[PDB]
């Protein structure tokens with residue numbers, strides 16, 4: 122009934138009623154004709170629709186409460202001096218328990234991203250990484266949870282030196298502006314346009330030098346499908362236009378990235394993230410090690426992302442060759458770290474939002490951000 126100091130009680134065991142707490146519920150922003158949505162709030166049909174998908178939203182909520190209670194715990198102990206591995210393992214151990222891990226029914230949506238400084242996304246330590254968090258590092262903690270495939274992609278930036286304060290603020294504000302500007306019938310390009318107006322209205326000072334915060338042009342937000350971290354649509358982050366419009370009932374990961382470098386990321390360092398291609402079908406394989414690894418991936422991760430450590434813990438050993446095979450065969454896709462130029466700094470803020478018929482829900486919102 123009550124959560125223990127160091128979190129240990131599944132979110133499921135904390136709410137005996139089976140109903141989980143909603144996120145921040147906003148009213149879809151108007152348009153040119155000031156077209157308010159004070160009607161969707163209680164329209165008769167839009168209310169029935171929402172009630173129809175009620176169990177889905179509830180799943181997203183059970184996953185968001187896991188995320189909120191885990192990141193809250195991480196913010197109390199993450200300190201420079203700890204290795205990137207100890208950090209991720211302490212974060213995932215807790216996350217496995219609150220979400221009440223259970224095969225594909227409930228678990229960790231993707232690996233724990235702790236991309237450092239100029240690296241903005243997709244870096245997680247591999248066995249052997251001796252990297253230690255430093256007082257001057259700007260670490261992006263990006264991890265996800267899920268219940269029955271309903272994914273919560275939510276992230277924040279951690280720092281210990283205040284010289285980054287105003288940078289985090291630029292990006293946190295850009296992220297919120299994106300969340301606030303999003304909604305049914307809103308064109309992606311417009312969301313990107315705005316996120317950039319705000320983002321670039323900030324300018325910071327770091328170690329004597331001064332920069333105008335830049336959105337990482339080739340990074341962005343995305344729509345979220347069941348067991349599919351990237352459903353299909355994308356949220357710009359800059360003057361990009363895409364060619365689409367957000368629709369009713371969609372789930373989006375709103376995230377923005379700010380940088381002091383070029384505002385462009387590139388594949389860098391060693392690969393840790395991997396994910397079975399959703400579109401790819403059943404391919405027959407006779408090669409032993411490859412066949413067995415693919416079985417492990419289907420059994421433990423489905424089309425959800427994973428990392429080398431997650432293979433290690435399952436007892437898998439010497440599997441890089443088999444992994445490269447699945448990658449070459451196009452069955453598995455590698456997701457390397459995305460880093461901007463050396464010396465630059467980068468920050469991120471992400472939230473998962475539900476575009477429900479009656480109102481817009483920032484399901485992953487919390488006391489913190």
Ligand SMILES: O=C(O)c1c(NS(=O)(=O)c2ccccc2)ccc2c1CCCC2
Pocket residue numbers: 231232242243274340341342343350351374376394395396426456459
């Ligand atoms: O970060 C993600 O949400 C993500 C993704 N989505 S994305 O292509 O929109 C993207 C967004 C931000 C940074 C990099 C990629 C696509 C594939 C993957 C991820 C995270 C885990 C690894 C696989």
Ligand SMILES: [Mn+2]
Pocket residue numbers: 263264274275276471
């Ligand atoms: Mn993320």
Ligand SMILES: [Mn+2]
Pocket residue numbers: 274342343374376471
């Ligand atoms: Mn994301």
